Amino acid sequence: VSPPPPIADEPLTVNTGIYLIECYSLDDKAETFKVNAFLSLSWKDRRLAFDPVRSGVRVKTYEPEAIWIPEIRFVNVENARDADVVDISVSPDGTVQYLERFSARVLSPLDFRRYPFDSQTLHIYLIVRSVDTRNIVLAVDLEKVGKNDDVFLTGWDIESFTAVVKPANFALEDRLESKLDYQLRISRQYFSYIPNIILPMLFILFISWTAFWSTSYEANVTLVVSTLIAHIAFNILVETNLPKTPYMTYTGAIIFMIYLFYFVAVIEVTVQHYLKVESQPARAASITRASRIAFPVVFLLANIILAFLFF
Amino acid sequence: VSPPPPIADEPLTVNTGIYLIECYSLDDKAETFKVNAFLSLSWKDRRLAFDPVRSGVRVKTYEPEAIWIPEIRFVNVENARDADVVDISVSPDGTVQYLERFSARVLSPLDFRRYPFDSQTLHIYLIVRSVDTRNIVLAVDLEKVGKNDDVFLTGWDIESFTAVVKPANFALEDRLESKLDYQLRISRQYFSYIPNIILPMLFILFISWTAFWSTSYEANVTLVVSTLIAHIAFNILVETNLPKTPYMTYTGAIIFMIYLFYFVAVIEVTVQHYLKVESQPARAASITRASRIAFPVVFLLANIILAFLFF
Amino acid sequence: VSPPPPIADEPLTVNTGIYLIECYSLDDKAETFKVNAFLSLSWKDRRLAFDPVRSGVRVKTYEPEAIWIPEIRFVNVENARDADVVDISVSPDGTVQYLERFSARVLSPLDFRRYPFDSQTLHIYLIVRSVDTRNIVLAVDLEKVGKNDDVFLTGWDIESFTAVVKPANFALEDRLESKLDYQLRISRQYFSYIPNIILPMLFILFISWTAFWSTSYEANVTLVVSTLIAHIAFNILVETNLPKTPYMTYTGAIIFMIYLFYFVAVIEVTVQHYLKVESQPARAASITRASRIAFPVVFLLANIILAFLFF
Amino acid sequence: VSPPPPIADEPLTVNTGIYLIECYSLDDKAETFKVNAFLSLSWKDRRLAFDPVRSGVRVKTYEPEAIWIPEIRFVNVENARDADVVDISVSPDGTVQYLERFSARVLSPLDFRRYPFDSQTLHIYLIVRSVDTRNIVLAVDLEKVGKNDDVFLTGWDIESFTAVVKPANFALEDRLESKLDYQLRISRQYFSYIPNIILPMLFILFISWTAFWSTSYEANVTLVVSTLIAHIAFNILVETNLPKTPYMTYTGAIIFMIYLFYFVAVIEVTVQHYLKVESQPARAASITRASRIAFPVVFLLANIILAFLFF
Amino acid sequence: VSPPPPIADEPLTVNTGIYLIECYSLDDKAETFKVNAFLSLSWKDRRLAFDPVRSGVRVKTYEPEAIWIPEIRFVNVENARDADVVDISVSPDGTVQYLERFSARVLSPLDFRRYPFDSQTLHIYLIVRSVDTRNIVLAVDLEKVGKNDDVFLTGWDIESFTAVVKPANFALEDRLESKLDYQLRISRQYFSYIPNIILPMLFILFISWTAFWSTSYEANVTLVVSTLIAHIAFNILVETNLPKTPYMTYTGAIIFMIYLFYFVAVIEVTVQHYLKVESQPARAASITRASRIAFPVVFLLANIILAFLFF
Ligand SMILES: [Cl-]
Ligand SMILES: [Cl-]
Ligand SMILES: [Cl-]
Ligand SMILES: [Cl-]
Ligand SMILES: [Cl-]
Ligand SMILES: [Cl-]
Ligand SMILES: [Cl-]
Ligand code: NA
Ligand code: NA
Ligand code: NA
Ligand code: NA
Ligand code: NA
Ligand code: NA
């Protein structure tokens, strides 16, 4: 088999469409997601023209091996897609209607800067390489682009699934390549992070601040050190759900900042004890009373600054 | 091969059945379950009809490649099913009896609102796409729907395996699609959650309340802070067995509420110490004595409210 | 190809045998084990009979596709077995000797009631479905049932590998099915549980009982609470190696009971301190002295009761 | 195709060789290792003999399907090897030279008695089953046994890769079987265990012994209990890297013994406090001073005894 | 098919090129990385030469089976590459242009000495084995070596992708082997290690040094022991992201050194308490005041020494 011949000198247009059936396993650490979808392809092959009068049938059904099929691949996939041909329908003029159902693990970079209040644009890049006899170009059939109503991505809200209609045509290894960008817009369901991570982290921090209403050094050391250890546990828990980033994430910034609050609280607790042993409790009382206001105030202002810089 | 031709204009009815052999790996985080079952298919192909008295044979056995077989797929599967054809039998009138044994990983959303006292309806969606020559519709042969007595799903009780007899017929990408809903009703075996999570979580909370019978601030801080850390460990353990939900689960609600009880207990312990240092122990005694009743009473009432809102 | 015709009306007997080469990956949580074995099949096919004199051969070798072979399947497997045909030999009377080497992941329920001092009976269910032409029945060739001397299952002792000679013949989807039960009896190597879990768990519990020889409330709170946290860690460790069961396991029962001992120890420590503060130490001394005997005695008797109920 | 006929009655000798290209993933828990190697096979087939003078060709190249090839398998593999034929060459006398590149996951038991200062002998068992026409025997071509210079097994030192030249010939299921033992000798790189596990474990134990220079019961309880919890963490960490063994490992023996030292240290701390409360500090001082010498001395002697019993 | 015959006695030159499409999953523990790339091959086959005038074409497109193709393999891969042929083109003089898209898991040793401020040279080794008929040698077509601009390796910066132009020609089992070294230079994005591991580890260590401004032994024991436990948690966390090395890593050296600082801090805290109990506090004050300077000074100098030895 060889590609369809050009009537003039034009490239062969392969109309494409992706219909999402299932979306699952969005792995934040791996920056991957699994997809199960329909891939529709359409091109004119005049060598397959037929008379419905002679053949009896109005539409011809072919096996993939019997006819020429464009070598369509995905750019951003771990391994080649697991594909099963559903139908190959050829109409009298030679217009081929190809339909396959596929499953693939897609590589798509994620921006964690606003985590867990982040939104992402997942990409599925469709590609075709031009052959010697003729250049192959990709197009989007908007009528064949969509998603099933039941498509759910655990821990995410699906906003839209659209395609950039204009392909990216470029030279690669002395041949033309036609690339299409299918975009799946999603927003993270931040809900569960509030009762599971955010609020427990705030509770332990506020518990450490009870040391500002205590003169007992040994109880203060227990309050600040124990809650710090619990904060380390939450820091470790958060970083297990995330990849290592060359930038600070919103959660990472708050988590890091809270360490400074624990560190200054230890200094205050140390300074307070030192002065009381030195028979200067009036002075220790001034520092402790100021800390009761300073710690929640500086914490509120620093969080307003952080929220502003990130959102 | 081509589909059987219609006698009038009727769609081709493909009778279906699923017989469960094995049910395993219900993954709560992934919202998947693995299945090993028999898939039975039945349709009329008049081009295959034969005389019973002339032929001598009452049934004719065909290889899948020798005859036309409807392209039956599962909607909610990770990858295409691993299938092996068991038998193909044709009766004199041309009624085809198809049987295959398959294995598949099924995507089925789970409602965790009542966890670990939750019940689920797992779905297996059967689908057929119509051809240009004729429309293909699915039907349920109730005699061929069932499950093996030995079918066990670890940590779950299997209630029923039924099929919604009426298919969901709809247009998808300019062709008819016939969808059947096979439902596997299950209820969670909550047993183990009681001695492993619920009771140990209650024991540590009740241990924190012993601080209401102690005047020792240093020991009280140790009691409330250490038990809170153990509660954080149980919160982390519970969330590792569950996916992130855009709603509160029953267990999640209790776990979150218990943090408030630890927080108020720290306030009480702080207030008690502060008053004793201020030479007001008669007062600290009134707050401590009230706390001995208030804490278990508010805990009981809040749990009755939560159980009512969730069940 | 079609099944061998009956001389009278008798069912076709397929003699079976399983020879274990490798046993590995017994997953307690998944209730699975992997197997690598020889599967031997034997049946009479008169159509393949030959005379040794005119043929010059005492035996005839065939390719699987050249002759009829019974569709033998495993009931309790995750996916269909990975099989490679080793040999197909035909004797003059048409007696076929089939041999394949296979690998499979087997689903077999485990009884954890006596864990880690439990014994299991793993099952490998062989099955054949009858055809319209004739009924196919399975039999056991005891001479072809066995295991390699080097067969080792990590963390387990292999007792026996036998087959229930009488098949379970029953109707499934209007066709008769012949099922054989191959049983692999194993006993858990409990050894490592003693120095790694049992003894460390007993040491921390006995350490909490040193509080009965101390009047220091602050030190007592530290002793009981810290060891309880270590007991929670062991409870979590044990439950990670086990699936969730709708019954109590022997280890689970001891682990749960130990929480009650920690809870009563906290009450004793609280009662002791309360009385001392109330200027009643003579009385606290009576409760503490009684606890020194009561705690180890009640622990010994409760363990005798538990061991009796479980073994 | 059929096997080469014997000139007299001799068995067919299949000369073998394994050349290791890659060694990776030595899984201690699973007792497996992955291998990527060349498998070389050589045997005489007189039916393939040719004249080198008239043919003008010294060697003939065949495709696997064109000639008879012995069914060579591995005994100790999870699944059948993933093999690709590299070359088949036939000399004028009919000597066939077969070469394939394969990858396999090998099951090989490990002796953990001396862990992490252990050495292992990994096995790769080559096997051939005799055919009815003739007996097949295996041999080692030492000229075709070896390993690539770059072969590295992470966390291990590769000593040698040799083959036991004499095959193990035995009857299995009424046929002869010829088995070869390829041995890969390795020694564990214990280096990292010293700064990561051994020394931190010794530091915390020596920190618990500072309680022998303290009269403060509350601080002593904190010293011994906190370090014991850290020892439990190291015990858990060590057991996660190891399978469960029906014997004591060297590390396991030390870890278990250290618990006894923590237990006796708690007794000493309890006895010391009890005597001081009883107004007997002169006596408590004698026990504490003796403990300062006894604890490190008994620890040193017990470790010498353990090292002697294990090495 | 047979290899192209030599015009004189020259070896067959196979020009190669690798164009990286995707780089993902750099596993530090496994010392592997996954790659998705184009593999280009070019060689002269005179038997395929044609006249452009006579044929009416300037290029000839073949199927892989129709012509001779060199058996090109990767040395350092887990399993054989997953490859799909994209195009095969023949010029009039018999110059073959082969293009395939492949995916492979590559084994490449990593030097962790400078972790997490390390740089690596990942290798992809291309190999060809000579045939009895002729010697095959590999070459690099620099015009066909490169990478896509979007190629990202999570947690790493990609510096360059170059090839060592001269192959490593050597004998392996009496046949010439031609090996090419494709090098992917990467540098670790150390950023996240600073707020997640380095700084929290420094904060807890500096918190342990507050004990040098405290005379309270019980609070000092709590300060040093609790922070040491948190340091053990960070040591465990770091070692889970790394394989076991027969050398010290930069992070491993700092982590190990910090244990010595905790150990000496416990000695100081013990010595201080012992002297105060012995009625020698003036002396304890001299040791404590010296420790306030000695600990941060020795820590700074030891870190300068370590940074110098490692970088
Ligand atoms: Cl693809
Ligand atoms: Cl399917
Ligand atoms: Cl099977
Ligand atoms: Cl094999
Ligand atoms: Cl390869
Ligand atoms: Cl050489
Ligand atoms: Cl050569
Ligand atoms: Na084609
Ligand atoms: Na068909
Ligand atoms: Na304390
Ligand atoms: Na057959
Ligand atoms: Na062959
Ligand atoms: Na070829």
Side-chain angles (χ1 to χ4, degrees), chain B residues 24 36 86 89 101 193 216, chain C residues 71 74-75 78 218 244:
Chain B
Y24 54 108
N36 196 297
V86 173
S89 283
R101 196 181 157 175
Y193 293 88
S216 176
Chain C
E71 286 177 5
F74 287 106
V75 179
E78 300 234 318
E218 297 73 24
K244 282 150 192 195

Side-chain angles (χ1 to χ4, degrees), chain B residues 148-217:
Chain B
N148 157 29
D149 300 301
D150 306 340
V151 172
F152 77 100
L153 190 61
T154 306
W156 297 85
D157 290 313
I158 298 144
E159 264 84 50
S160 64
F161 182 65
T162 68
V164 176
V165 300
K166 193 96 95 75
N169 300 328
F170 62 99
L172 169 53
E173 283 188 2
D174 306 280
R175 289 282 178 82
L176 175 80
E177 220 97 18
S178 196
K179 188 166 112 281
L180 282 174
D181 181 14
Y182 281 82
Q183 302 177 350
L184 179 66
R185 258 157 286 259
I186 59 168
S187 60
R188 185 174 239 117
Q189 293 179 334
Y190 57 83
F191 183 101
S192 61
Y193 293 88
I194 308 157
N196 292 295
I197 290 130
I198 302 157
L199 299 172
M201 193 179 283
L202 291 177
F203 293 140
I204 56 145
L205 174 67
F206 302 161
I207 282 161
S208 83
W209 298 347
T210 63
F212 308 137
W213 280 269
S214 161
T215 47
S216 176
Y217 180 55

